[PDB]
DNA sequence: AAACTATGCATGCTCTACTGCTTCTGATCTAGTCGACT
């Protein structure tokens, strides 16, 4: 029962947007700490009858720090390819 | 004089080739991404 299955991507996107918008490092750290605390509290409340489940913050941590992603190889779609694919798919 | 038969013709139908026009498809040239090398 992974926590990421119950956490919408919109919440993470909003947290990242708030972090970027904030000017002082204190506000960014506060936002990230609030998100992490909510995630940890939800994880603790979900896995009550647990057996040392291998569920952690990796699903969100990898997205927050894509540069450290080693499990997944190169996507093969760079900025030019992404722009092209957006053009065909959206039928612009 | 009337009934049956004969030829004769026309037109629509079917097939096979023939030619020319239009559209689809297969072969041939380059941008990007990843990787190799010095």
Features:
part of a larger assembly, mainly alpha, 92 residues, DNA-binding, 1 chains, 4 helices
Task: Walk me through this protein's architecture.
The chain has 92 residues and is mostly helical. The termini are far apart. The protein is built from 4 helices and no strands. The radius of gyration is 17 Å and the shape is extended. The structure holds one DNA strand of 38 nucleotides. It comes from Homo sapiens (Human). This is DNA ligase 4.
Number of strands: 0
Q: Give the termini distance in whole angstroms.
A: 40 Å
Overall shape: it is extended
Count of discrete alpha- or pi-helical segments spanning 4 or more residues: 4
Helix content: 55-70%
Q: Using only CA atoms, what is the Rg?
A: 17 Å
- Write the element-wise H/E pattern from the N-terminal end onward: HHHH
Oligomer: part of a larger assembly
Amount of beta strand: under 5%
* Structural class estimated from helices and strands: mainly alpha
Taking the sheet with the most strands, its summary is: none
């Amino acid at each position: 029962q992974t926590v990421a299955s119950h956490v919408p991507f919109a919440d993470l996107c909003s947290t990242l947007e708030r972090i970027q918008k904030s000017k002082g490092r204190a506000e960014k750290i506060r936002h990230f700490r609030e998100f992490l605390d909510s995630w940890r509290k939800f994880h603790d409340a979900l896995h009550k009858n647990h057996k040392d489940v291998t569920d952690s913050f990796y699903p969100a941590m990898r997205l927050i720090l894509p540069q450290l992603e080693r499990e997944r190889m190169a996507y093969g779609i760079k900025e030019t390819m992404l722009a092209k694919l957006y053009i065909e798919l959206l039928n612009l």
